[PDB]
Amino acid sequence: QWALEDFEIGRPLGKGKFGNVYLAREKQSKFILALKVLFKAQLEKAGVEHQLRREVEIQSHLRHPNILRLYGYFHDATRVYLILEYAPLGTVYRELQKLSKFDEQRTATYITELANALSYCHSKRVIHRDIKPENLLLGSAGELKIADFGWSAGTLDYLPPEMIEGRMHDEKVDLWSLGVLCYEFLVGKPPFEANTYQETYKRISRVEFTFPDFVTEGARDLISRLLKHNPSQRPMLREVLEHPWITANSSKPS
């Protein structure tokens, strides 16, 4: 139903192998957004076409202030097009490169927003979201926007043991991701980073990680609770949102 004619096109916010993201403007409303233009030659060269169609169908039906909104989508002879909510302050990945580490307050707020968008995704029957720093955009007021949309070394770094060991994964994966994020926000590096993929797998599968001196005991307690080998041993989202160090350092309500 949407057409490229309906949009004024701006500078590239990001170039990729699968395609481009443009600053754009719906000509009618002058509303400003982001156009993810994808080349189906590369939706062919890889096997993502079906996963892509799915993701669009799920994300369209999602509406949360901490989830990047997919407004709509269209296609053409050569390309796919994705009408996305524009988040003007960049990815959390960039920000972490800027600041090196985050304070307790910023970190707890990000964790609060994530836990809320992840409990909503759970209720909406979405059990997983990648939530890696490069998939987390920042809105006008610095608010987090989960943007699990696009795929364009630390591939292993955020994955829980049930995955890397080739097993079965439930909702509890999102708890492990939180612990990894919470660690990285505070320390500037994911807890299991290593020079080789094998060493990273070794630390993940044996939950082997340590804290630099400055990470306060509430922070250690939450991270430790989250980074459990057994999935069922990981707390539910509501215990994270109601956790002492969260409640004590978060500025955004639950």
Ligand X SMILES: *Cc1cc(CN2CCN(c3nc(Nc4cc(C5CC5)[nH]n4)cc(C(=O)NCC#C)n3)CC2)ccc1O
Enter the tokens of residue 101: 């580490």
CB of 21 to ligand X, least distance (A): 4
40-69 binders of ligand X (CB under 6 A): 68
Cα dihedral sign for 205, 134, 37, 16? negative
Q: Which of 24, 70, 83, 84 binds ligand X (CB under 6 A)?
A: 84
The verdict on whether residue 85 carries a ligand-binding annotation is: yes
Q: Which of 24, 67, 70, 87 binds ligand X (CB under 6 A)?
A: 87
The pairing of beta strand 70-75 with beta strand 32-39:
unpaired
Q: What letters, b where the CB count within 10 A reaches 16 and e where it falls short, cover 150-167?
A: beeebebbbbbbbbeeee
The verdict on whether residue 230 carries a ligand-binding annotation is: no
Q: Which is nearer to ligand X, 58 or 215 (CB)?
A: 58
Q: Which is nearer to ligand X, 86 or 158 (CB)?
A: 86
CB of 3 to ligand X, least distance (A): 19
Q: Confirm whether 130 is a catalytic residue.
A: yes
Tell me the CA end-to-end span of the chain in Å, nearest whole number: 37
Q: What is the largest CA-CA distance in the chain?
A: 57
Cα(36)–Cα(87) distance, integer angstroms: 13
Q: Which is nearer to ligand X, 14 or 244 (CB)?
A: 14
13-72 binders of Cl ion (CB under 5 A): 54
